Amino acid sequence: GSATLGRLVRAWPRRAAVVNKADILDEWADYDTLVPDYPLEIVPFAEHPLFLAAEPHQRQRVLTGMWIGYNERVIATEQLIAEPAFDLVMHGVFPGSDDPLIRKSVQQAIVDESFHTYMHMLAIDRTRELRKISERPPQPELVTYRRLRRVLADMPEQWERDIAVLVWGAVAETCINALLALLARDATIQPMHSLITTLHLRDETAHGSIVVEVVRELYARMNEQQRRALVRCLPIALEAFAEQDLSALLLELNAAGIRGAEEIVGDLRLVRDFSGARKMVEQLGLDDAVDFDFPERPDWS
Amino acid sequence: GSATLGRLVRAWPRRAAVVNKADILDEWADYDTLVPDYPLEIVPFAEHPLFLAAEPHQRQRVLTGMWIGYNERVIATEQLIAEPAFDLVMHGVFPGSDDPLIRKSVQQAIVDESFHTYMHMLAIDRTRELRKISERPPQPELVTYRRLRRVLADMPEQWERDIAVLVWGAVAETCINALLALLARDATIQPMHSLITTLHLRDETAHGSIVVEVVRELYARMNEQQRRALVRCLPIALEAFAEQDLSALLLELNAAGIRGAEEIVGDLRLVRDFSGARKMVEQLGLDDAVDFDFPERPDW
Ligand SMILES: O=C(O)c1ccc([N+](=O)[O-])cc1
Numbered sequence: 118g119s120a121t122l123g124r125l126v127r128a129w130p131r132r133a134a135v136v137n138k139a140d141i142l143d144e145w146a147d148y149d150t151l152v153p154d155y156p157l158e159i160v161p162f163a164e165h166p167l168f169l170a171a172e173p174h175q176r177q178r179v180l181t182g183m184w185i186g187y188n189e190r191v192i193a194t195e196q197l198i199a200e201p202a203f204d205l206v207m208h209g210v211f212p213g214s215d216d217p218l219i220r221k222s223v224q225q226a227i228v229d230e231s232f233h234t235y236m237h238m239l240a241i242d243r244t245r246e247l248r249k250i251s252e253r254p255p256q257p258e259l260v261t262y263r264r265l266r267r268v269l270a271d272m273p274e275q276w277e278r279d280i281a282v283l284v285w286g287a288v289a290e291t292c293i294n295a296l297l298a299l300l301a302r303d304a305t306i307q308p309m310h311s312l313i314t315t316l317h318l319r320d321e322t323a324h325g326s327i328v329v330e331v332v333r334e335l336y337a338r339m340n341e342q343q344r345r346a347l348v349r350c351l352p353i354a355l356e357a358f359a360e361q362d363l364s365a366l367l368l369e370l371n372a373a374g375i376r377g378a379e380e381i382v383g384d385l386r387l388v389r390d391f392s393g394a395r396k397m398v399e400q401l402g403l404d405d406a407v408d409f410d411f412p413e414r415p416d417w418s
Numbered sequence: 419g420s421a422t423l424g425r426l427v428r429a430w431p432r433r434a435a436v437v438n439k440a441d442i443l444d445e446w447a448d449y450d451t452l453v454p455d456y457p458l459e460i461v462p463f464a465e466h467p468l469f470l471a472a473e474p475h476q477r478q479r480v481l482t483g484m485w486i487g488y489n490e491r492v493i494a495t496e497q498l499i500a501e502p503a504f505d506l507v508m509h510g511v512f513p514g515s516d517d518p519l520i521r522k523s524v525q526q527a528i529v530d531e532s533f534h535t536y537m538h539m540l541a542i543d544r545t546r547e548l549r550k551i552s553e554r555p556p557q558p559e560l561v562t563y564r565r566l567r568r569v570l571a572d573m574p575e576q577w578e579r580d581i582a583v584l585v586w587g588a589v590a591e592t593c594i595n596a597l598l599a600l601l602a603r604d605a606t607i608q609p610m611h612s613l614i615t616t617l618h619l620r621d622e623t624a625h626g627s628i629v630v631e632v633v634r635e636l637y638a639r640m641n642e643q644q645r646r647a648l649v650r651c652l653p654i655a656l657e658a659f660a661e662q663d664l665s666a667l668l669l670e671l672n673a674a675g676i677r678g679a680e681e682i683v684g685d686l687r688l689v690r691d692f693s694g695a696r697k698m699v700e701q702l703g704l705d706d707a708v709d710f711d712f713p714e715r716p717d718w
Pocket residue numbers: 190191194195199289290294296297317321
């Protein structure tokens with residue numbers, strides 16, 4: 118079997134966030150209210166006159182809002198997209214998925230996603246308590262998940278829905294959110310915010326390599342119509358993850374009471390790093406077969 | 419907020435198997451084939467004439483099979499019974515489950531279960547490789563799970579289906595498998611078999627405490643149709659976890675080639691520790707209400 122997978126499985130205890138920083142809760146021990154929750158430098162409307170026209174506390178509420186929103190989206194992605202793909206592999210629904218090495222690598226990844234959800238949930242709860250955020254609108258469904266559910270809606274056969282769920286999860290795990298990497302490195306914000314994202318990023322880098330190996334091994338064992346289905350779904354999943362939907366920015370801005378929110382939003386890199394998914398496509402021998410224009414690899418990757 | 423929940427949440431990093439023994443895979447290192455997989459002492463037919471009349475390799479294969487069978491059932495219970503209950507709580511479907519302290523304790527439990535699944539899956543794979551078992555027959559449906567399906571068939575809408583899943587999960591997590599506790603302490607079997615079960619038991623002791631606190635809080639916020647449904651549900655789950663299913667014994671014997679497997683099973687304590695479940699019952703004030711005869715606490 119895959120030497121990459123063997124390596125990753127053996128390294129998991131030395132690498133995983135759950136092992137090496139289970140005590141993340143205690144990181145709020147000596148809290149400093151004076152330090153921002155989110156970096157202005159990565160806010161797209163940061164230097165817009167209408168955002169600058171606001172009062173300092175209003176800008177701070179937007180930053181806090183964007184931090185909480187980012188954590189909400191991470192949790193929804195894990196729960197709705199990434200973990201269901203991993204679960205399908207463990208359920209043995211694809212030929213070749215009964216392999217002990219695939220099962221070890223993916224179950225380890227499932228333990229990691231559980232802990233990621235734990236860390237991001239803690240981040241929301243601590244922020245909401247300490248910033249005294251009593252109530253906040255529960256709204257927008259992920260653009261990525263909306264696209265998934267629409268693809269699946271009329272699909273007759275379970276075998277094909279399984280492919281779609283696998284591909285959506287694979288793309289999620291190989292296309293790193295710019296906010297994850299940018300937040301991870303940021304020294305201007307709450308240290309627990311850059312720490313949680315640093316931890317998640319370390320695990321996600323491994324998850325991307327795992328997914329590339331597992332997807333190659335399963336595609337190899339698939340029959341032609343399964344292979345055909347995987348190929349069709351790739352560009353559709355890729356486009357869903359390339360899609361910027363700034364409905365969340367609007368809500369945050371309106372929440373903070375910023376005048377001209379619709380104007381600021383209607384007015385608008387933070388592109389994902391698609392490097393991993395490009396490697397995935399290469400390992401499947403699909404280089405020329407996928408109709409997707411891959412963005413350049415970010416400096417931070 | 420619950421002082422129990424608080425203490426268990428803050429202790430989790432020191433307690434959790436996932437933190438303490440993430441490198442469980444490496445425990446197979448200097449592997450000694452001479453050490454048994456499973457203790458004859460806790461095998462219910464160990465002293466049966468027809469078992470004793472079988473060859474030494476046949477009896478050692480049964481022990482291997484029962485160890486693998488044990489692990490298979492643990493994984494199935496976690497995946498089909500315990501995790502769904504915990505997920506339901508995190509899904510916020512029940513009033514009062516939005517509580518951050520509840521959410522931390524239960525999410526930590528979910529991390530634990532994913533790692534328990536990992537440990538047990540590893541034990542199966544490493545045993546199957548080292549004992550050279552290339553072939554193993556399909557296992558029967560869990561008795562506990564078959565009974566769950568039955569209740570869910572009888573009880574209709576989404577709203578009742580949530581309550582049943584919750585109770586099934588709660589009973590599973592508060593009634594400790596005799597085999598869990600007896601394997602954990604066994605000094606004669608593969609060190610990593612007693613280690614995995616020692617680790618799982620340490621976590622499960624905490625999970626039982628977590629579940630009693632959570633279910634109590636969720637019971638308080640339920641509407642009258644819901645409480646009625648939960649109360650009617652407790653004894654059925656409890657009976658389900660108390661009923662013995664001999665079908666998995668008949669498989670290990672009929673696989674290892676032991677003649678008269680039917681008579682052995684025909685001729686056939688490993689009773690769960692219901693202590694945690696009894697506490698759950700009193701915490702709900704259903705002491706007089708529940709028609710279930712709790713066995714005396716087992717010695718272990
Ligand atoms: O930081 C993020 O946005 C992020 C979201 C999801 C995943 N994930 O699918 O595990 C990782 C990072």
